[PDB]
Amino acid sequence: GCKRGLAYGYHSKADMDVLSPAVSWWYNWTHVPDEGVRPDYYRTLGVDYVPMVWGGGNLDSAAAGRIASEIPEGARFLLGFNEPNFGAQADLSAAEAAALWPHVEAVADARGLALVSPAVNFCGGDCQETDPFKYLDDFFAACSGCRVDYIGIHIYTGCKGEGDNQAQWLINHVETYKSRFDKPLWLTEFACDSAGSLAEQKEFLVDALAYLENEPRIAKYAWFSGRADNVRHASLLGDDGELNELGQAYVSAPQHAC
Template sequence: MRPALPGRVSGLTPGKPARKTLACLLLGKRDVCTRILTFKEDMPMMLRKLSAQLRTLATPALLALLLGLSIAPAWAADKSAKRGIAYDISSPNDLSALSSGVSWWYNWSPKPHDRLASYDYASMYGVDFIPMVWNDNVDDGQLKLYLQAHPAIRYLLVINEPNLLDQANMTPEAAARFWPRLEQIAAQTGVKLVGPAMNWGTMAGYGDPVLWLDAFYAAYRAMNQNRDPQIDYLAFHWYDYGLAGMLDRLARYGKPVWVTEFANWHGLDDGLQIDSLAKQKQQMADMVATLEGRADVFRYAWFTGRMTQDPHFSSLLSDEGRLTELGQYYLSLPYSE
C-alpha cells in the first residue's frame, strides 16, 4: 500500500590527548583527526561535514582505529544489509534515528523527500534510498536522467500492488505492455528490476497474487515471442501469519525476493488478532527471523515509520528523531552474516 504522501547521532566522544596524538601520527591527517577527536555534542553541523571527510579517508586501518576509539561513524555500523523500512522519511533526524539498524528505505516515489535531496545519506547514515516506479504513469526520460545522475542506485522497485484497485490497479495485460519500457530503462542505466510488488488484492479474478503473476508471465510471453520478462527480483507484501508459506509459493518463479512491506495486521476476532505491542513484537521477531534465515530473501522493509492511527502497533517512530519501543526492537533484532 502507499499512504498519503505529504507534498512533495549521537555525539562523538572527545578523545584523550595521548590517543589523539597517536591517531594523527598513524594517519598523517593531524588536522582532520584533531577536529574529529575534539568534536562536541553541541556542534551538529560539523558532524555532516566530518562524515563526508571520513568517507573520503576511509581505509581498513582508519576504520579499525575509529572503532578502537569508540567513535565509529554511523555508516560503519554493524547491521543487516537486508533490513529496511517502507516510509516517506522527510526528516534527517528520523533517518539518523533509524540508521543504526536500517540499511535502506523507499517511499513509493522515484526520488527521496525534498528535505533530504541535499544530503549524502549513504555516506552520512549508511542508508540507501531505493526509487520506485509506482505504476505506468512515469516520465521515462526524467527517470533515466535521475538514475544516470545517481549511479550508486542499483535497484528500481516497480508497480506497487497492481491487483489492488486503490493502488497501481493494473491488469496482467497492462503490466505486460508496460514492462518493455522498464526493461529499456534498466538496459540504459544498469539498475535491477524489483517487482511487481504483489499483495492479496481486490481485482476481480486476481485476488491471489500468484494468479496475477501467472497471467502476467503468460501475457508478456504472448507479446514478446515467448520470451520471459526481465524480473531480477520479485517483490511482495505481507500482513498476516504464514509468511514462510507465501515465500514457498513464490519459489515457483525461481527469483530472489524483496518483501517490501510487512507487519502483522491480523484483525479477525479469533484470538489471534494483533491488538497489543507485545503481540506485534513477537510477530516482528518471528518474521524477521524467517526473512534473515532464508537465502531466497534479498531484502525486507517494515511498514511503517509513523502512523496517526496505529491500531496494530506497527509504527517505528514517535516524535521526530525518536524511535518507538517497537522501533528500538526492530533495530536490535539479530541478523544473518
C-alpha cells in the same frame, strides 16, 4: 548485501540517524528520495535509496528519460508497479503491466539497475486479480522477453501465528512463493494487521525477522512503516529522531552476514 529496509517517505535526518545502525536501505513509492534527507545526507550515512515506478499512468519513452535523469546517483535497483492487481492501487491487468514494462526496463537499462517485479498480495475487494501467484504467472507469460531480476511481494497477516511462532502465517506465504517461483524475493511491505496491543506486534516482528534473515530466497525486506496511521502498532518512530519500542526491536534484531 544487508536485507533490512523500510517502506516510508517522510524521514528526517534525525529519523535516519537512529534507523541507520541496521536499516541499510529504504524506498518511498516514488523515484526521488525523501526531501528531509536529500540530496546528500542519506548518502553520507550510507543508506541505499531504491526508486519505484508506482504505476502505469503518463508513461512513455520521454517519461522514462525523465525518471532516469531524476533518480539519484548511486541507485542500483528499480521497483516495478505497486499492487497492480488492486483496483485501488496501480490497477493494471497482468497483460497491461507486461505491455508497459518496456518503459520500466528502459529506465533500468539506462541507469544500470536490477529490476524488481510489480509487487503483489492477496486482494479480497475491488480486485483485477485476487490471487497474487496467478497474477505473477500471468505477468511472466505476458512479459516473456522482459528483464525481471527479483519478485516483489507484500504480506500482511494476523499477529498470532502458530504455536510459539507468531510469524507463522507470514512464513507460510513466503514458502508458497518459494514453491511457485524460482526467482529471489523482496518482501517490500509487511506488518501484522490484528495487533490488540503493542506486545502482539513486537512478538510478530521478532519471529518474522528471525525467519527472513535466515531464508536465502529473501534478498531484502522492508517493514511497513516509519509512521503509520492505519496498521495498529506498526510505527517504528515517535517524535523526530526517536525510535519507539517497536523501532528499537527492529534496529536491534540479529542480522545474517552483515
